[PDB]
């Protein structure tokens, strides 16, 4: 034994235990999700209200990269911010050299390679976050989810955090019941419901819902936060479904 004391060490199984321990920090975090719709993507996250002293709507969790990509994550929040900062550098250099905004699959690999690099040495620690991200490019909508190992795939729907099992089941129903697809406005409503349903794993404290979206028709392919009436409408739809 001792194989789990140092990053980048293969165990006799062929496993990197330090990466597996980073996953535990992710599983301890709040629930975040992503839904791929007809012409875009929707992101939503659970924000635990630890105290009344928290200013509502101020501690924003979802982050924009460039102007067309949204990122949300569960686990160690600072680690997620570090990853998004790198992502913003990657996107800037891509656009600098190639002019066009970075495609989503291209952006996915940039984050992937960077996270994977933090599994190669014992002088660094793996990322304690799973990141759900995506947006709209020239080939349409793309949704990705990236793990501490550096592993990522494309998704129809994605979920991570403490209430991921509940969320996944809800996402799987939507895929089955809508083979033709889901509209952007429908996806916002559904995203609100799923976070509310996933909040049962974090039922002790009450929470605040935060939603964002990129859609070709609804936001011109730019990342925007869901605010005001459209947010309230989604909260009402969600509250109606849990009762």
């Amino acid at each position: 034994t001792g194989y789990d004391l140092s990053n980048s060490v293969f165990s006799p199984d062929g496993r990197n235990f330090q990466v597996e321990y980073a996953v535990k920090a992710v599983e301890n975090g709040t629930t975040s999700i992503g839904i791929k719709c007809n012409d875009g993507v929707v992101f939503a996250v659970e924000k635990l209200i630890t105290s009344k002293l928290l200013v509502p709507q101020k501690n924003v969790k979802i982050q924009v990269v460039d102007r067309h990509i949204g990122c949300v994550y569960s686990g160690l929040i600072p680690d997620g911010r570090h990853l998004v900062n790198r992502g913003r550098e990657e996107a800037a250099s891509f656009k600098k050299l190639y002019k066009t905004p970075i495609p989503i699959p291209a952006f996915a690999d940039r984050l992937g390679q960077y996270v994977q690099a933090h599994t190669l040495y014992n002088s660094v620690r793996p990322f304690g976050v799973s990141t759900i991200f995506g947006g709209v490019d020239k080939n349409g909508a793309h949704l990705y989810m990236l793990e501490p190992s550096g592993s990522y795939w494309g998704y129809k729907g994605a979920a991570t955090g403490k209430g991921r099992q509940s969320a996944k089941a809800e996402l799987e129903k939507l895929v089955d019941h809508h083979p033709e697809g889901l509209s952007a406005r429908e996806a916002v409503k559904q995203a609100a419901k799923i976070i509310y349903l996933a909040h049962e794993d974090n039922k002790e404290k009450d929470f605040e819902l935060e939603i964002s979206w990129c859609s070709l028709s609804e936001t011109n392919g730019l990342h925007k936060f869901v605010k005001g009436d459209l947010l309230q409408e989604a909260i009402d739809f969600a509250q109606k479904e849990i009762n």
């Binding site: 690099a117 190669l120 040495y121 002088s123």
Partner: protein
Amino acid sequence: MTDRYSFSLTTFSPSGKLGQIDYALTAVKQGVTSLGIKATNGVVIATEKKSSSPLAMSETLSKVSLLTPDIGAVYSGMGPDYRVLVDKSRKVAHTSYKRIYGEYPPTKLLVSEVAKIMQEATQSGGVRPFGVSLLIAGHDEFNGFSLYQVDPSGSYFPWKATAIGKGSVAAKTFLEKRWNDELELEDAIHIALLTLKESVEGEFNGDTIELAIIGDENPDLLGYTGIPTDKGPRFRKLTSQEINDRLEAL
């Protein structure tokens, strides 16, 4: 990141042993047998092509490698370590000699350079020693024909004939009985084939045996004519057919 292993990974133990070098020699002991014999008019180096799978094309894996036109090398131990050492040996023959003196290095000095590289992997920070022993055969104008062994420590010794790897102890005894100072190159090849048969289990033919010589200049392998002083390489790898012809007179 940064390489933060700036300290030695090979150190002296209380008994005065350098553990990592001893363990590297143990890896060499597990390796497939290779040998070398020096004749009056040439040198021969040989080994078994232990194919990992019959679907594998063992001709694409070269255990016997040309270092310079007059110098060749074979190994026992870890193949990948050997391959990178061959790359470094080929380059250092140019950078530290041919680009300075306009000619290829003599065998003993190229051996000295390879030895230095292997020594440094035994003292430098954050590295392990090379897990190979090399046999280097060559010719040069002023020293004539020569054969050298290089070990993981970086130590090297000249031999009349020797063997390394799996069945080296038995092979060296076999060579002691047969070797004399009047051997012609064909006699040395014959003795090499006889010696190598003892350590080989399965098939023993031109396709499973790799054999090369340092002998006469080969003007047919030079690739050009017109310069009298340039007469071609002395290193030549024997073909599958050439080996089989000498296995009938075995």
